[PDB]
Structure formats: C-alpha cells, structure tokens
Write a structure and sequence with these properties.
The structure is cut from a larger assembly and holds chains A and B. Chain A contains 1 helix and no strands. By secondary structure, chain A is an all-alpha fold. Chain B is an alpha+beta fold. Chain B folds into 2 domains: 214 residues, Cytochrome Bc1 Complex, Chain A, domain 1 (2-Layer Sandwich); 204 residues, Cytochrome Bc1 Complex, Chain A, domain 1, CATH 3.30.830. Chain B has 17 helices and 12 strands. In chain B, the strands form 2 sheets. Chain B has a 6-stranded mixed sheet with strand order 1-2-6-3-5-4, with helices on both faces. Chain B has a 6-stranded mixed sheet with strand order 7-12-8-11-10-9, sandwiched between helices. In chain B, strand 4 and strand 5 form a beta hairpin. Chain B is globular, with a radius of gyration of 23 Å. The chains are: A mainly alpha, B alpha+beta. Chain A: It comes from Gallus gallus. Chain A: It is found in: Mitochondrion inner membrane. Chain A: This is Cytochrome b. Chain A: Belongs to the cytochrome b family. The PDB classes it as oxidoreductase.
C-alpha cells in the first residue's frame, strides 16, 4: 500500500501516543531519571559513593 | 436554409394512447422503407434474485416463433418479405423492432403484437437456447469492456436491483422454467408499459388503426393499468478489483451517481463530457486533438482508449469514465483523468463549452440518422421523458449552457464525492481507493 496516507497517518498517531508519556514525564516528574549527584558542581576532591552511567 | 429552420421544419412526432394504455408514436418522412417496433419498460432491474436473466431468456425465444405461427413459418414469413427483425434488453428497457418497407407497416405491426403477446415458449426450444445463452456468457466473459461495466454496476449499486447483470446468473439460466419465462412475459409485457413507435413513410393513422386491431387485451382491474414504481437503488462509493496479470491490458472505470432521465442537469452533464470527450489510438488528430485528456494521452502514451459517459436511469445514473491502458501507465492516466474532472468543476472556459456544445449538437442530430435510430429515440423519450423532445428543443437547452453553468453542475455531482470504481486485468499500479478518493478535490 502507498505509504501515504496509511503510514504517514499511522506514524503521526504513534508520534502522539508516545509523545504523551514523554511530555508527562518531562513536565511532571522532571528529574525522575536523573542522579541528584549532578546538582553538585564537579569536585575532584570528593568521589561520589556510587559512580554509575545513565 | 439555416440550421435553425431545418430544425423547425422537422415533422412532428404523433402520440396517441389506445384504450388498454398502450401508446403509439411515429415520425413520418418521405421514406419508402421504415422501422416500427415496441419499446418496453422491462429488464433485469425489474427482475429479482430468482428470475434474474428471464428477460434475456425471453429475448432468446421472442423470435423462435409464436403459437399462431411456429418457428419455421415465422422465420420464413419474415425473411421472404425482406424485413429485418432485431431487438435487445438492458437493465431498465427491452425492445423488439422491425425494418421493412412502409408498404408492409401493418403486416409488421401484426407480427410484433404476435411476438410480445403470443411467444411460443416451446418446451423443447428452451432447453436449447439454454445451452446457447450459456455459450454467449462465456464469449462475453472475454469482453473486458463489458465485464468492467458490469462490475462497475455490481458495486456502484451493490446490494440492489441495479447491481444485476442483464444476462443473469449461471444458475438462474440453468434452472429457469417454461413457467418463470411465461410469468415474466405475463407480468411485464403490458400495454401501459409499452410503446409502439415507428418512423419512415408511415401514416400515423394507418398505424394507430392497425394498432387497435392487434393490440387488444383489455385490462379489468385497476392494478393492470397503473405503471409500478420501482424501489430505489442505493449508490455506494466503493471499488472492486478483479486482478489478472495474465491479461495484456488493464481496464478502469470510475463514476459518481447520476441524476436520472428526467433531470435537466443531464444536458449540462452531457455538455461536460463533450469537453473531456474520448480518445483511441486510431484518432488521427493525435497531439492536436482539442481534448486535453486526449492530448496528454498522446503526449505521454497514457492509454489505448478512453470514454466518458452519462448512463442514465429512471431514478438514478452513472457519470464517469473508462479507459484501457498498459500495466505501467495506469496511474499517470488515472491521475490526469481525475485532473480533468477537477478542471471541469473549477476552471472551465467559455471556449471549451462553446465547442463542447457544437460537438453535442452534432451528436444528437447523428443519433437520428436513419429510421431505426429515430424509432429508437421515440420509443425511448416516451418511455423515459413521457413525451418527445425535438432537436429544436434539445438545441435550445444546449445553447443555454455556459461555463459558469458547467462548473456548478459538475461541482454538484463530482466534487468531493466518493466514487465507485472497477478495475480489471493487471491493475497493480493503480492503487488505493483512498488515493483515488482524494483525487476528487482541489483542481
């Protein structure tokens, strides 16, 4: 089938379906995923307790 | 002598109703030969699921002789007078007509009446024409153009009376009975629904007299002389795709619902199709043809042929187009076509219509080129319009059409409408109803 409108439409739908949770998070629980340790300016004389990547 | 006058000077069409309700009409000319026949308001549409195809089976026996004079005799008697006997049957109209010298106008009329009123229906003949019709179906099955139009209806009027083929189902033809056929005739072939029309060197009176003489059968109850109105047929924007990459070319038909015989717009609609017109690889005009679609068709090798149409019916119709193309040029063709429909609705020119009109005028005039064609026009106008519309009139209605008018009507019938489409053959490149549906708006 032709991509348009079938998938152009289907993708635009899938865009809003995911975009909702993204925004919901980004806006209501902003730092839900970030380490609070990064609200402290880098300091070479204090190793954090648990250094782990994202 | 101006066209204007040559029109006024066209003799009138005489119409008189007998007592049983039959209408006799005719146009007298100075011609030694003529065409007389009965045009009936019957056909597949009037059929049902169980008798679909009867009217056609009947057509197949109408000539195989009557009770008063069997096959051999009937045939021999007609051939021997040099008369030609022909007839047909469509969805809403059936007809049997004869071509002979005016001198035999009455003996003809007799014959006609004997055919519609006393068909033999010889039990033995049926079983033979049954094998015959069955053969005709197989031959017609290989005529893509009619297989397509059938499918077009099949879906454009899906689920209704009009969605049936004139010839009928295979089963229906394998089992129809002497009874069912008889019944069809006795139920449908009736005076109030018939018209004895004729044209040539015939005297209306000599005709109407010979009419009263052989078309007797007077009706008793009120039911017998009121013409039954048919339940309506619902249009449906939809598509049917019968694919077969094995066929050499593809056939495509697209249409919106039509207005129906009585509606005046039909004139403008025809004026419109006159603009788009038609093409076919043997038109020498080639790239200079006036029809934009035809040109593109030529400039870009878009197709083998194409035709616009305005098939009308009592209460509905089909306004669209059909084209035959090669598997790989279906899309461009379709694309361009829908383009023109859009042009009609949004940007028609006075220049365009002016021409379309002349082409249309010449058309109506040519529709009456001989006696059979005239008789066919009389037999129809009455049956459909309830009277006769003379070239003098048609012309006035056509002359009144202007751009601003063509636009409005086409818009009213084409713009943003869900169309019915039927494709047959190697149709892979033509695709998606959705896409086609959107080609229904914005120039």
């Amino acid at each position: 089938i032709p991509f348009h409108p079938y998938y152009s439409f289907k993708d635009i739908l899938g865009l809003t379906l995911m975009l909702t949770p993204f925004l919901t998070l980004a806006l209501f629980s902003p730092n839900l995923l970030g380490d609070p340790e990064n609200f402290t300016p880098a300091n070479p004389l204090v190793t954090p307790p648990h250094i782990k990547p994202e | 002598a101006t066209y204007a006058q040559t029109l006024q000077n066209i003799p009138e069409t005489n119409v008189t109703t007998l007592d049983n309700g039959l209408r006799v009409a005719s146009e007298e000319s100075s011609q030694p030969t003529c065409t007389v026949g009965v045009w009936i308001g019957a056909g597949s549409r009037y059929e049902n699921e169980k008798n679909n195809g009867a009217g056609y089976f009947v057509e197949h026996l109408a000539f195989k002789g009557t009770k008063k004079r069997p096959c051999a005799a009937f045939e021999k008697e007609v051939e021997s007078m040099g008369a030609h006997f022909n007839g047909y049957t469509s969805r809403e109209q059936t007809a049997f007509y004869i071509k002979a010298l005016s001198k035999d106008m009455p003996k003809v009329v007799e014959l006609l009446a004997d055919v519609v009123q006393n068909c033999a229906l010889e039990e033995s003949q049926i079983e033979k024409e049954r094998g015959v019709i069955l053969q005709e179906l197989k031959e017609m099955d290989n005529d893509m153009t009619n297989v397509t139009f059938d499918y077009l209806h099949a879906t454009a009027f899906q689920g209704t009376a009009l969605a049936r083929t004139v010839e009928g189902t295979t089963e229906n033809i394998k089992h129809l009975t002497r009874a069912d056929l008889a019944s069809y005739i006795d139920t449908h072939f009736k005076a109030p629904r018939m018209v004895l029309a004729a044209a040539g060197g015939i005297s209306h009176k000599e005709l109407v007299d010979a009419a009263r003489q052989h078309f007797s059968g007077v009706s008793f109850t009120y039911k017998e002389d009121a013409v039954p109105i048919l339940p309506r047929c619902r249009f449906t924007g939809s598509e049917i795709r019968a694919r077969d990459d094995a066929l050499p070319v593809a056939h495509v038909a697209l249409a919106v619902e039509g207005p129906g015989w009585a509606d005046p717009d039909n004139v403008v609609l025809h004026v419109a199709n006159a603009i788009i017109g038609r093409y076919d690889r043997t038109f020498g005009g080639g790239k200079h043809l006036s029809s934009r679609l035809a040109a593109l068709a030529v400039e870009h090798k878009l197709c083998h042929s194409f035709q616009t149409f305005n098939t009308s019916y009592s209460d509905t119709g089909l306004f669209g187009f059909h084209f035959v193309a090669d598997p790989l040029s279906i899309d461009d063709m379709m694309f361009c076509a829908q383009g023109e429909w859009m042009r009609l609705c949004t940007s028609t020119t006075e220049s365009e219509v002016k021409r379309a009109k002349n082409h249309l005028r010449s058309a109506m005039v040519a529709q009456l080129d001989g006696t059979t064609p005239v008789c066919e026009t009389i037999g129809s106008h009455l049956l459909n319009y309830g009277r006769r519309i003379s070239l003098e009139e048609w012309d006035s209605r056509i002359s009144a059409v202007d751009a601003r008018m063509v636009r409005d009507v086409c818009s009213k019938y084409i713009y943003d409408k869900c169309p019915a489409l039927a494709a047959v053959g190697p149709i892979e490149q033509l695709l998606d109803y959705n896409r086609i549906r959107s080609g229904m708006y914005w120039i």
